[PDB]
Amino acid sequence: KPEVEHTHSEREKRVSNAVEFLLDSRVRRTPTSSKVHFLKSKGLSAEEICEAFTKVGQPKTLNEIKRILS
């Protein structure tokens, strides 16, 4: 196949893992930093984490995510 993009199914599934994890009641009670650090360690990118957060009803900018990861 002509590789025009990256495997979006892989990205989509990573975001899926994040959205499910972020929407966890107990995780809703943990700090944002803990959420972000864990998702990153799950193989997600900052952009993907930013999206997953917005998916769970937490609109974070990419700047926040990179900041929290640094």
In angstroms, what separates the terminal alpha carbons?
A: 36 Å
In DSSP terms, counting alpha (H) and pi (I) runs of 4 or more, how many helices? 5
The name of the CATH topology is: Arc Repressor Mutant, subunit A
Largest sheet: none
Query: Whole-number radius of gyration?
Result: 12 Å
What's the level 1 CATH class? Mainly Alpha
Given helix and strand content, the structural type is mainly alpha
Protein name: Peroxisomal membrane protein PEX14
Biased composition (Basic and acidic residues): 1-15
Family: Belongs to the peroxin-14 family.
Domain Peroxisome membrane anchor protein Pex14p N-terminal: 10-54
Topology:
Blueprint lengths: L7 H15 L2 H5 L2 H10 L4 H10 L6 H8 L1
Helix pairs in contact: 1-4, 4-5
Protein name: Peroxisomal membrane protein PEX14
Family: Belongs to the peroxin-14 family.
Subcellular location: Peroxisome membrane
Description:
69% of the residues lie in helices and 0% in strands. The protein is mainly α and 70 residues long. It has one domain: Orthogonal Bundle (Arc Repressor Mutant, subunit A). Helix 1 (8-22) crosses helix 4. It is globular, with a radius of gyration of 12 Å. It is classed as signaling protein. Keywords: Peroxin 14, Pex14, Trypanosoma, peroxisome, signaling protein.
